[PDB]
Design an enzyme around this catalytic site. Structure first.
Site, short mmCIF file in Angstrom:
data_model
loop_
_atom_site.label_atom_id
_atom_site.label_comp_id
_atom_site.label_asym_id
_atom_site.label_seq_id
_atom_site.Cartn_x
_atom_site.Cartn_y
_atom_site.Cartn_z
CG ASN A 176 10.25 49.54 66.03
OD1 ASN A 176 9.49 48.56 65.94
ND2 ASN A 176 10.68 50.02 67.20
CB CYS A 229 11.54 45.58 70.91
SG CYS A 229 10.83 44.57 69.59
CD1 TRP A 279 6.59 53.94 75.87
CD2 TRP A 279 7.19 52.18 77.12
NE1 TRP A 279 7.72 53.38 75.31
CE2 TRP A 279 8.10 52.30 76.06
CE3 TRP A 279 7.35 51.13 78.04
CZ2 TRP A 279 9.16 51.41 75.88
CZ3 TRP A 279 8.42 50.25 77.87
CH2 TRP A 279 9.31 50.40 76.80
NE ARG A 281 5.45 38.57 74.75
CZ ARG A 281 4.47 39.47 74.73
NH1 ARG A 281 3.51 39.44 75.65
NH2 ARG A 281 4.44 40.40 73.78
CD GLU A 331 8.99 54.92 72.08
OE1 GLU A 331 9.31 54.96 70.87
OE2 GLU A 331 8.67 53.87 72.67
CE1 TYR A 380 14.27 49.36 73.55
CE2 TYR A 380 12.23 49.98 74.66
CZ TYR A 380 12.92 49.15 73.79
OH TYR A 380 12.23 48.11 73.21
N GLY A 438 9.73 41.93 65.42
CA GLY A 438 9.09 43.02 64.70
C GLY A 438 7.67 42.67 64.31
CG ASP A 439 2.91 43.99 65.15
OD1 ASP A 439 2.54 43.89 63.97
OD2 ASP A 439 2.09 44.16 66.08
CG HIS A 449 6.15 38.65 64.44
ND1 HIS A 449 7.36 38.80 65.10
CD2 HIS A 449 5.27 39.45 65.10
CE1 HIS A 449 7.21 39.65 66.10
NE2 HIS A 449 5.96 40.06 66.13
CB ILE A 450 2.20 39.16 59.43
CG1 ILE A 450 3.09 40.03 58.55
CG2 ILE A 450 0.72 39.54 59.29
CD1 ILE A 450 2.95 39.73 57.06
CE1 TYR A 451 1.63 38.61 67.66
CE2 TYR A 451 2.18 40.86 67.01
CZ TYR A 451 2.37 39.76 67.85
OH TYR A 451 3.27 39.82 68.88
NE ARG A 509 13.32 41.56 72.45
CZ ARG A 509 12.02 41.24 72.44
NH1 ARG A 509 11.59 40.21 71.72
NH2 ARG A 509 11.15 41.94 73.16
NE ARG A 543 36.97 48.83 61.35
CZ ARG A 543 38.10 48.54 60.70
NH1 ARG A 543 38.11 48.51 59.37
NH2 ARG A 543 39.20 48.26 61.39
NE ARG A 544 37.21 49.03 68.03
CZ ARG A 544 38.45 49.30 68.44
NH1 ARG A 544 38.67 50.25 69.34
NH2 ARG A 544 39.47 48.61 67.95
O1 LIG Z 1 1.19 51.09 71.78
C1 LIG Z 1 2.00 50.95 70.87
O2 LIG Z 1 3.22 50.32 70.87
C2 LIG Z 1 3.81 50.25 69.55
C3 LIG Z 1 5.19 50.81 69.58
C4 LIG Z 1 6.17 50.42 68.69
C5 LIG Z 1 7.44 50.96 68.72
C6 LIG Z 1 7.73 51.92 69.67
O3 LIG Z 1 8.99 52.48 69.72
C7 LIG Z 1 6.76 52.32 70.57
C8 LIG Z 1 5.50 51.78 70.51
C9 LIG Z 1 3.64 48.80 69.20
C10 LIG Z 1 2.95 48.39 68.08
C11 LIG Z 1 2.79 47.04 67.82
C12 LIG Z 1 3.30 46.10 68.68
O4 LIG Z 1 3.12 44.76 68.41
C13 LIG Z 1 3.98 46.49 69.81
C14 LIG Z 1 4.13 47.84 70.06
C15 LIG Z 1 2.91 51.17 68.79
C16 LIG Z 1 3.04 51.64 67.51
C17 LIG Z 1 2.03 52.49 67.07
C18 LIG Z 1 0.98 52.87 67.88
C19 LIG Z 1 0.86 52.41 69.17
C20 LIG Z 1 1.87 51.56 69.56
O1 LIG Z 2 35.68 38.26 64.98
C1 LIG Z 2 36.24 39.19 64.35
C2 LIG Z 2 37.10 40.16 64.96
C3 LIG Z 2 37.67 41.15 64.15
N1 LIG Z 2 37.38 41.17 62.77
C4 LIG Z 2 38.00 42.22 61.92
C5 LIG Z 2 37.08 43.41 61.55
C6 LIG Z 2 38.10 44.52 61.50
O2 LIG Z 2 38.80 44.40 60.26
C7 LIG Z 2 39.11 44.16 62.63
C8 LIG Z 2 38.64 44.71 64.00
O3 LIG Z 2 38.90 46.09 64.00
P1 LIG Z 2 37.86 47.17 64.53
O4 LIG Z 2 36.46 47.04 63.86
O5 LIG Z 2 37.53 47.03 66.03
O6 LIG Z 2 38.35 48.58 64.29
O7 LIG Z 2 39.09 42.75 62.65
C9 LIG Z 2 36.57 40.25 62.17
O8 LIG Z 2 36.35 40.31 60.93
N2 LIG Z 2 35.98 39.22 62.94
O1 LIG Z 3 9.51 48.60 69.43
C1 LIG Z 3 8.79 47.57 69.37
C2 LIG Z 3 8.33 46.83 70.53
C3 LIG Z 3 7.54 45.69 70.34
N1 LIG Z 3 7.23 45.28 69.00
C4 LIG Z 3 6.39 44.09 68.80
C5 LIG Z 3 7.15 42.82 68.37
C6 LIG Z 3 6.30 41.75 69.02
O2 LIG Z 3 5.13 41.49 68.23
C7 LIG Z 3 5.81 42.41 70.32
C8 LIG Z 3 6.85 42.20 71.41
O3 LIG Z 3 6.66 40.91 71.94
P1 LIG Z 3 7.91 39.91 72.23
O4 LIG Z 3 8.88 39.79 71.03
O5 LIG Z 3 8.82 40.46 73.36
O6 LIG Z 3 7.45 38.52 72.53
O7 LIG Z 3 5.75 43.79 70.01
C9 LIG Z 3 7.67 46.01 67.90
O8 LIG Z 3 7.37 45.64 66.72
N2 LIG Z 3 8.45 47.16 68.06
#
Ligand SMILES: O=C1OC(c2ccc(O)cc2)(c2ccc(O)cc2)c2ccccc21
Ligand SMILES: O=c1ccn([C@H]2C[C@H](O)[C@@H](COP(=O)(O)O)O2)c(=O)[nH]1
Ligand SMILES: O=c1ccn([C@H]2C[C@H](O)[C@@H](COP(=O)(O)O)O2)c(=O)[nH]1
Ligand SMILES: O=C1OC(c2ccc(O)cc2)(c2ccc(O)cc2)c2ccccc21
Lengths: 286, 285
Positions: free
Chosen positions: A200, A169, A83, A24, A61, A109, A191-192, A230-232, A189, A149-150
């Site tokens: 994080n 993220c 932020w 992106r 934060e 968040y 990770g820089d 990823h690594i930029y 999802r 477990r939930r």
């Molecule tokens: O501005 C900043 O956002 C970061 C941040 C990370 C996790 C978090 O929970 C809050 C912020 C971050 C760093 C790299 C990225 O690719 C995206 C965001 C960050 C880390 C360290 C210093 C500054 C920053």
């Molecule tokens: O798609 C599924 C649904 C359930 N379970 C298993 C995990 C647990 O053994 C039990 C669900 O119980 P709880 O984690 O919610 O307590 O069923 C799976 O392995 N896959």
């Molecule tokens: O807590 C955070 C928030 C953002 N990022 C990084 C991952 C990506 O490089 C960028 C987010 O961009 P998108 O994945 O949304 O495209 O910031 C982190 O590593 N940790």
């Protein structure tokens, strides 16, 4: 074996086996999909040492998340500006939120953590008792049914996504109790590796310390799970230098008083002891 | 062989997991946090050291995709895995005495196709209501395959009290590189003996379907677990299974060009070369 080596091994793996992947920001990355690391929280705190981590920002934060704030200015006023760009007038206008005051990030968040499902008006509204307080639910379940477990806190909200300044993220975390120890797994999802992931890791390790304290447990493991790791492209040379550094022993995290509820934590309750990171080194993608 | 990933996870739990009581009263050996990668390139990870109920995998997924929350619609296909949770007894225990038999509440199919919509009952018309996460994922794969936000999430804290069961396969993410589609599942709780093999096939199948719809090749299925556990009455059966050599994984063939995800039918799918070892294991309640 030092816990930081897992992070260094992940960086190494991406540099050796990652694929070129456009992204992106237009910077470009080397990328691997699906990674997992385990950081022990037992009598040490995984604040990375081969490059300094902005601990003050981590702590402020997280406290800002916990009070459910969606105002960038409320975090900025503590000296933490991470932020601010996402709440600026020009950024909010690019997303069509011209009616928002500057700093209004939408239901990101902290709102999802404390008020999931409530209707998002603006950052200054009163949301007391609205929506699902996932954070308190997690704490209550750890106390009364630690085998559960939930035990999940989820910031990913498909309905609220278009209202947010950025899509979450660190999307979902789960807690787990065994042998008197509390563990946490984060699904992240995206990770820089160079600049974001160390922050994080510290963030969720701290959250686990906080909740373990509230619930009378000992911190166990933080399990870090990545989607797009990823690594930029402009981090390759600095990280290759960082990868030759030997980790120093992790610091400790002390909590300086007995705290009864998650909302009562303040900055002065925490002390990082013995943190000696290697001297500094990286451009951030936008 | 990719099945060695699963077998090594079983072995790791047997060797290193902790005893942990559980909701069912069975008790488990448990590890928190595991990950395995199953290649989907020119093979399909339907496990061989024990037969997987592939008919249930396929029909359950098709049932998810059409958004059904009615266990009777799956049962009529001869797949009874949801029937107990839709039964009167189970529904009355949760406080759902006003709900008719089969009504599971807003579980996977509803969340996938109608996230955020107001659930009424299983017979309601939810056309156009809520977020169609499934179609959104497909659209994004087509238009912006580099996107790092391609997520379908069944975990819905607002709707949790209405569901027959809290979602187990809670969130998945898709990823594209070099013309290959990968999928990672976050599964909060995994019954290694009986559940996990079915889960692997289910999301490997979903990835094959979306790759077919989007003109891509299947890449990896990354399986991530929270509480990965072996029920205590599965230990001896699984120790038998671990001595079995895996046979090469079957192939999955899609038998016609399908244009939209809602147009797949059972007849479009053929598993070729599936020679599992004989089945073996008691189910926790
Ligand atoms: O501005 C900043 O956002 C970061 C941040 C990370 C996790 C978090 O929970 C809050 C912020 C971050 C760093 C790299 C990225 O690719 C995206 C965001 C960050 C880390 C360290 C210093 C500054 C920053
Ligand atoms: O798609 C599924 C649904 C359930 N379970 C298993 C995990 C647990 O053994 C039990 C669900 O119980 P709880 O984690 O919610 O307590 O069923 C799976 O392995 N896959
Ligand atoms: O807590 C955070 C928030 C953002 N990022 C990084 C991952 C990506 O490089 C960028 C987010 O961009 P998108 O994945 O949304 O495209 O910031 C982190 O590593 N940790
Ligand atoms: O009834 C059945 O539920 C199972 C199932 C798993 C995933 C899924 O998507 C659908 C169903 C299951 C097995 C063990 C458990 O502990 C919980 C559930 C299952 C697997 C194989 C055969 C029957 C069943």
């Amino acid at each position: 074996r030092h816990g930081e080596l897992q992070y260094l091994r992940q960086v190494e793996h991406i540099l050796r086996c990652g694929f070129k992947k456009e992204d992106r920001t237009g910077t470009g990355t080397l990328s691997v999909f699906g990674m997992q690391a385990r950081y022990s929280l037992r009598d040490e705190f995984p604040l990375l040492t081969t490059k300094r981590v902005f601990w003050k920002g981590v702590l402020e934060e997280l406290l800002w998340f916990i009070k459910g704030s969606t105002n960038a200015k409320e975090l900025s006023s503590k000296g933490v500006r991470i932020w601010d760009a996402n709440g600026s007038r020009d950024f909010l206008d690019s997303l069509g939120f011209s009616a928002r005051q500057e700093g209004d990030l939408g239901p990101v968040y902290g709102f999802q953590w404390r008020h999931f499902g409530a209707e998002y008006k603006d950052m200054d509204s009163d949301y007391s008792g609205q929506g699902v307080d996932q954070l308190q639910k997690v704490i209550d379940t750890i106390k009364t049914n630690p085998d559960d477990r939930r035990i999940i806190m989820c910031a990913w909200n498909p309905k609220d996504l278009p209202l947010m300044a950025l899509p979450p993220c660190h999307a979902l975390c789960q807690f787990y109790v065994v042998n008197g120890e509390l563990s946490c797994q984060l699904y992240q999802r995206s990770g820089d590796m160079g600049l974001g992931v160390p922050f994080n890791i510290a963030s969720y390790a701290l959250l686990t310390y906080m909740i373990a304290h509230i619930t009378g447990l000992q911190p166990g493991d933080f399990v870090h799970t990545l989607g797009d790791a990823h690594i930029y492209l402009n981090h390759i040379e600095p990280l290759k230098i960082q990868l030759q550094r030997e980790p120093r022993p992790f610091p400790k995290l002390k909590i300086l008083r007995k705290v009864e509820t998650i909302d009562d934590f303040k900055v002065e309750d925490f002390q990082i002891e013995g943190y000696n990171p290697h001297p500094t080194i990286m451009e951030m993608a936008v």
